[PDB]
Design a binder for this molecule. Structure first.
Ligand SMILES: *CCC(=O)Nc1cccc(Nc2nc(Nc3ccc(N4CCN(C(C)=O)CC4)cc3OC)ncc2C(F)(F)F)c1
Length: 271
């Protein structure tokens, strides 16, 4: 019960920061109960889910989210129950890493890119450690606190209560299996996205075709900046054998290592 119940009046909505299928997000401010502190927040207002069954499901996931406490996982500050369900999130000033990489390709240096993989993999392991399957992981579901500090957006479990085929493990596509190991495959696609400075994985190829492509042993291409210790880690995540895949603990070490000598593993444009 680490989940704060917020009063509609404790916060104000400044601007719409987009709207998805799940809900609508706003840049806003929140003045906590009996405090003269003004926190910048993101307010995830939820869609058509007013059924008593659904609201109990929402709340139950809201407590789960509210107990996920890790530096690289976006924190849930509280919930506001009124006419609509509002999820008061920590504001991420630089938007999503995908947009950010597509907007900084030139100035994004090897040392940052490698430290983002450690950061993502760190947050991911926390979920595998809490036995929570992310199910979402894409460069679009990683947000930017500071360009040095990224955080993962844990909505995969909530979104469950519009198919991301190109980020999915073959077992997820063909047998609807979601393990912390399918989370490793998605992680591979995400790290490929950052190394390509936000490219479309398998662009122009239809979703239906993707399964057979992967079955024919075909994978995502080698990104120009990538070395061989790098592009290898990527293909180990895309192993048809769900258990041949590296663990999130492994990925942390082989990237933590890699981050100690960046340019050795990434060929940017100096230095
Ligand atoms: C690439 C995927 C993406 O756009 N994710 C995204 C979009 C909007 C809102 C969230 N939630 C969220 N956001 C923040 N901070 C944040 C997010 C996005 C922006 N952008 C969005 C694209 N854009 C537009 C449409 O004008 C430019 C600005 C800016 C911003 O910071 C002020 N923090 C937390 C959340 C959370 F609720 F999801 F936790 C994600």
């Amino acid at each position: 019960a680490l989940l704060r119940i917020l009063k509609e009046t404790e916060f104000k909505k400044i601007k719409v920061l987009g709207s998805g299928a799940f809900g609508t997000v706003y840049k806003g401010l929140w003045i906590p109960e009996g405090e003269k502190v003004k926190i910048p927040v993101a307010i995830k207002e939820l869609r058509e889910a007013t059924s008593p069954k659904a609201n109990k499901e929402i709340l139950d996931e809201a407590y789960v989210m509210a107990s996920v406490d890790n530096p690289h996982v976006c924190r849930l500050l509280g919930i506001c129950l009124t006419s609509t369900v509002q999820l008061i999130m920590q504001l991420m000033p630089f938007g999503c890493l995908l947009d950010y990489v597509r907007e900084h390709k030139d100035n994004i240096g090897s040392q940052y890119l490698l430290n983002w993989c450690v950061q993502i993999a760190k947050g991911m392991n926390y979920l595998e450690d809490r036995r929570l399957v992310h199910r979402d992981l894409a460069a679009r579901n990683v947000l930017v606190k500071t360009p040095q500090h990224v955080k993962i957006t844990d909505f995969g479990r909530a979104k469950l209560l519009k198919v991301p085929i190109k980020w999915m493990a073959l077992e997820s596509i063909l047998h609807r299996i979601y393990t912390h190991q399918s989370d490793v495959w998605s992680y591979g696609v995400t790290v490929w996205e950052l190394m390509t400075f936000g490219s479309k994985p398998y662009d122009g190829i239809p979703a239906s075709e993707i399964s057979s492509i992967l079955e024919k042993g075909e994978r995502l291409p080698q990104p120009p900046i990538c070395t061989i210790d790098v592009y290898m880690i990527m293909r180990k995540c895309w192993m048809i054998d769900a258990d041949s895949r590296p663990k999130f603990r492994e990925l942390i070490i082989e990237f933590s290592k890699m981050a100690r000598d960046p340019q050795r593993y990434l060929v940017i444009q100096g230095d």
